[PDB]
């Protein structure tokens, strides 16, 4: 049991700060992130669609590079400042808002000073001054915002595309397109057993950022014919850019497995925190908070027409600051507009009635599971689970109503009840309010949801950073690595479909978070001090005074 203590101390060190000044970065990272030749970018230039929204808004490095570009020209720079102001303004609370709102009005709409855009209609200016002072609303400046973006997205965009800044962007992009492999990362101790493989911590060598690596063993996939499940979780996480769903940064392959590299949630899973963390369950305030986050998560997925179908403690995880994110989306699936889907899938205990009955549905099942979970967090026990068998529990779900203890408050009961209403058409969330009607339950008196979704609300429990919230290494399952299955050409075509490489938005973020972008992107400072002697070894006209003093006394 040296192995246990070893692996644990390693991981915690990586989580601490790698090896000194370089924050986990390999000593040869600059080499690893060496830009390519400009000629090496043309093929790529052509590939990239000229899309304002993609190149200047969605893609953080791309956005930075544009912003940086706009700094070179004051008429632009000031636009960017304006948009910045409004984005802040819109998230500034009621009492402080008008105070903040005037500063903008006075700065960017002074009728004596220079114009904001080349053609700003005067009538549109007077309206704001008026509309503001009486009732400062959230969509106050939408008129100007819209015009500003319409301005930038045409000429300044074109001018940028045709500037050095874009050449830089192309290079940055070239790097993200470079193939990802085993060798990109450092591996650490495993943190769990998935359906199809291990799930261990890991680190990007070049950048030192920590990720979780969900391994899916190539063989175990073919045996269980879970090709759909694997590609599905990928394609889904690839698309979802939610604050409450583990984001995917890389998809690659090895000899033995396909990997998904995912946000690393150091606070561990809610299953651990409910059971193996002192007395079972959480206080009300706490249980509620998570239910509210998990709710926002579901809102996020649903809004992208995705039903999750596997909410449960195992698959909710906690981050460094004690916030949560949904995970394991193998069972998730898209729900086309105006349609319904049937699929008897999930975990025994958390599948709602209509799923168990093998009926058609849209999003009902998730709101059920939120109920189950919100129950389980207060109660300290699954509402339908000592070992029991499958058929018994399903009966328990389909017919018997839930059984409460006295930990539940008055309103705490009603919510779980309404979520565990067995009639899906009458269930909370499914009546025709979506998340809104669940958010509006009085149990969430105290939480401003607008803020929670912006991650501005502090949770009631910050994890201990020095703690590792899961089992030790040898105290973990390991199913029979079954032989009797050869990998064949048909599988290679699929692996090609899966092993995409680095996910743009996350990847780009990684570089900015690890100061790799700033450190490497900038150009003109290093080795720029105009030199003491010209090429032929003679001083300039006139010579540098610091050399003369150094050459004599
Ligand atoms: N796929 C994932 O997102 C993760 C799975 N685990 C662990 O592996 C188990 C598999 O559900 C969980 O209970 C966690 O202990 C994780 N641990 C930390 N961060 C993550 N992103 C995951």
DSSP one-letter string for 114-147 = --SSSS--SHHHHHHHHHHHH---TTSSHHHHHH
Nearest in space to 316 (alpha carbons), one of 280, 369, 354 = 369
β-strand pairing of 306-307 with 324-326? unpaired
Q: Are 386 and 394 in contact (CB under 8 A)?
A: no
**Range(s) within the chain of domains with CATH label 1.10.287.1270:** 37-72+154-179+499-528
Nearest in space to 86 (alpha carbons), one of 94, 97, 77 = 97
Nearest in space to 442 (alpha carbons), one of 412, 405, 419 = 412
For ligand 1, the distance from its centroid to the CA atom of residue 270, given in whole angstroms, is 10
**Range(s) within the chain of domains with CATH label 6.10.250.2260:** 529-553
Q: Give the span between the Cα atoms of 476 and 309, in whole angstroms.
A: 26
Question: Which mutation among 216, 265, 310, 329 tests ligand 1's pocket best, with the greatest number of atoms within 8 A of CB?
Answer: 265
Nearest in space to 541 (alpha carbons), one of 533, 549, 553, 529 = 533
Question: Between 504-513 and 60-71, two packed helices, what is the crossing angle to 10 degrees?
Answer: 60
Give the H/E segment covering residue 189.
strand 185-193
- Ligand 1 atom, smallest distance to 314 CA: 13
In the annotated binding site, the residues are 191-199, 214, 263-269, 314-317
Q: What are phi and psi of 22, to 5 degrees?
A: -75, 115
Q: At 49, is the secondary structure helix, strand, or coil?
A: coil
- For tokens 């400042």, the residue is 81
Beta bridge partners of 326: 245, 316
The residue whose CA is least distant from atom 21 of ligand 1 is 264
Beta bridge partners of 318: 324
Q: Give the span between the Cα atoms of 311 and 357, in whole angstroms.
A: 19
Q: What are phi and psi of 412, to 5 degrees?
A: -55, -35
Question: Which mutation among 199, 328, 347, 350 tests ligand 1's pocket best, with the greatest number of atoms within 8 A of CB?
Answer: 199
Q: Is 265's C-beta closer than 6 angstroms to any atom of ligand 1?
A: yes
- For tokens 């004051």, the residue is 74
The residue whose CA is least distant from atom 7 of ligand 1 is 192
The residue whose CA is least distant from atom 8 of ligand 1 is 192
506 CB contacts (<8 Å, ≥6 apart)? 247, 248, 249
Question: Is 526 an annotated catalytic residue?
Answer: no
Q: Give the span between the Cα atoms of 98 and 108, in whole angstroms.
A: 15
Q: Give the span between the Cα atoms of 524 and 51, in whole angstroms.
A: 29
- Ligand 1 atom, smallest distance to 328 CA: 1
Nearest in space to 323 (alpha carbons), one of 501, 468, 461, 519 = 461
How far, in Å, are 284, 291, 325, 329 from residue 443 at the CA level? 10, 11, 21, 28
The burial of 155, by beta-carbon neighbours within 10 Å (0-12 exposed, 13-18 middle, 19 or more buried), is given as exposed
For ligand 1, the distance from its centroid to the CA atom of residue 285, given in whole angstroms, is 25
Q: Is 1-36+180-266+475-498 a domain of CATH 3.40.50.2300?
A: no
Q: Give how far the C-alpha of residue 157 lies from the chain's centroid of Cα atoms, to the nearest Å.
A: 28
Nearest in space to 3 (alpha carbons), one of 188, 213, 209, 274 = 188
Question: Between 123-134 and 94-108, two packed helices, what is the crossing angle to 10 degrees?
Answer: 160
408 CB contacts (<8 Å, ≥6 apart)? 378, 379, 416
Give the DSSP letter string of 253-265.
Answer: E-SSEEEEEE---
Q: At 16, is the secondary structure helix, strand, or coil?
A: helix
Q: Give the span between the Cα atoms of 67 and 80, in whole angstroms.
A: 7
Q: Is 324's C-beta closer than 6 angstroms to any atom of ligand 1?
A: no
Q: Are 265 and 325 in contact (CB under 8 A)?
A: yes
Alpha helices, DSSP H, located in 48-93: 52, 60-71, 74-91
**Range(s) within the chain of domains with CATH label 1.10.167.10:** 73-153
For ligand 1, the distance from its centroid to the CA atom of residue 543, given in whole angstroms, is 64
User: What CATH number is given for 529-553 in this structure?
Assistant: 6.10.250.2260
The highest-level CATH class for domain 267-474 is mainly alpha
**Range(s) within the chain of domains with CATH label 3.30.200.20:** 1-36+180-266+475-498
**Range(s) within the chain of domains with CATH label 1.10.510.10:** 267-474
Q: Give the span between the Cα atoms of 449 and 443, in whole angstroms.
A: 12
Structure's resolution in angstroms? 2.7
Alpha helices, DSSP H, located in 92-226: 94-108, 123-134, 142-152, 155-161, 164-177, 218-224
Beta bridge partners of 251: 260
Q: Are 439 and 431 in contact (CB under 8 A)?
A: no
Beta bridge partners of 200: 190, 213
β-strand pairing of 360-361 with 210-217? unpaired
So what's the architecture of 73-153 in CATH?
Orthogonal Bundle (1.10)
How far, in Å, are 192, 290, 371, 511 from residue 377 at the CA level? 21, 9, 10, 37
Tell me the fold of 37-72+154-179+499-528: Helix Hairpins (1.10.287)
Beta bridge partners of 269: 317
Q: What tokens does 297 get?
A: 């998560």
Computed over its alpha carbons, how large is the radius of gyration of the chain? 28
Q: What are phi and psi of 200, to 5 degrees?
A: -120, 155
The residue whose CA is least distant from atom 5 of ligand 1 is 199
378 CB contacts (<8 Å, ≥6 apart)? 281, 282, 284, 287, 407, 408, 412, 416
The residue whose CA is least distant from atom 13 of ligand 1 is 314
């Amino acid at each position: 049991e040296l192995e246990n203590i070893v692996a644990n101390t390693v991981l915690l060190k990586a989580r601490e700060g790698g090896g000194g000044n370089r924050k986990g970065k390999s000593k040869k990272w600059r080499q690893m992130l060496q830009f390519p030749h400009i000629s090496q970018c043309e093929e790529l230039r052509l590939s990239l669609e000229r899309d304002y929204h993609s190149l200047c808004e969605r893609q953080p490095i791309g956005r930075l590079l544009f912003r940086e570009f706009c700094a070179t020209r004051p008429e632009l720079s000031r636009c960017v400042a304006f948009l910045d102001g409004v984005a802040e303004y819109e998230v500034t609370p009621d009492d402080k808002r008008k105070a903040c709102g005037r500063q903008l009005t006075q700065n960017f709409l002074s009728h004596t000073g220079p114009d904001l855009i080349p053609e700003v209609p005067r009538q549109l200016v007077t309206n704001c001054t008026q509309r503001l002072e009486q009732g400062p609303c959230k969509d106050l400046f939408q008129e100007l915002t819209r015009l500003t973006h319409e301005y930038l997205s045409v000429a300044p965009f074109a001018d940028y595309l045709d500037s050095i800044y874009f050449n830089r962007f192309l290079q940055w992009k070239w790097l993200e397109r470079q193939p990802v492999t085993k060798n990109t990362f450092r591996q650490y101790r495993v943190l769990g057993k998935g359906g199809f493989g291990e799930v261990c911590a890991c680190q990007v060598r070049a950048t030192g950022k920590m990720y979780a690596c969900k391994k899916l063993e190539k063989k175990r996939i073919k045996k269980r014919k879970g090709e759909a499940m694997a590609l599905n979780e990928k394609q889904i996480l690839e698309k979802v850019n939610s604050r409450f769903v583990v984001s995917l940064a890389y998809a690659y392959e090895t000899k033995d497995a396909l990997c998904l590299v995912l946000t690393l949630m150091n606070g561990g899973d809610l299953k651990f925190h409910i059971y193996h963390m002192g007395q079972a369950g959480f206080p009300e305030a706490r249980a509620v908070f998570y239910a509210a986050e998990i709710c926002c998560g579901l809102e996020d997925l649903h809004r992208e027409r995705i039903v999750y179908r596997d909410l449960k403690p195992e698959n909710i995880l906690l981050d460094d600051h004690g916030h949560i994110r949904i995970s394991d989306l193998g069972l998730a699936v898209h729900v086309p507009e105006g349609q319904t889907i049937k699929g008897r899938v999930g975990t025994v205990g958390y599948m709602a009635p209509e799923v168990v009955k093998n009926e058609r549905y849209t999003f009902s099942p998730d709101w059920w599971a939120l109920g189950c979970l919100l129950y389980e967090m207060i109660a300290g026990q699954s509402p339908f689970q000592k070992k029991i068998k499958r058929e018994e529990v399903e009966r328990l779900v389909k017919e018997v109503p839930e059984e409460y203890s006295e930990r539940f408050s008055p309103q705490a009961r009603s919510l779980c009840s309404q979520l565990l209403c067995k009639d899906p058409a009458e269930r909370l969330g499914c009546r025709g309010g979506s998340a809104r009607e669940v958010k509006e339950h009085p149990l969430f008196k105290k939480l401003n949801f607008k803020r929670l979704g912006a991650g501005m609300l502090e949770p009631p429990f910050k994890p201990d950073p020095q703690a590792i919230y899961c089992k030790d290494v040898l105290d973990i399952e390991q199913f029979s690595t079954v032989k009797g299955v050869e990998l064949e050409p048909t599988d290679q075509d699929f692996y090609q479909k899966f092993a995409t490489g680095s996910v743009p938005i996350p990847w780009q973020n990684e570089m900015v978070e690890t100061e790799c972008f700033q450190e490497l992107n900038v150009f003109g400072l290093d080795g720029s001090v105009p030199p003491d002697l010209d090429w032929k070894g003679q001083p300039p006209a006139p010579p540098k005074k610091g050399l003369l003093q150094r050459l004599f006394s």
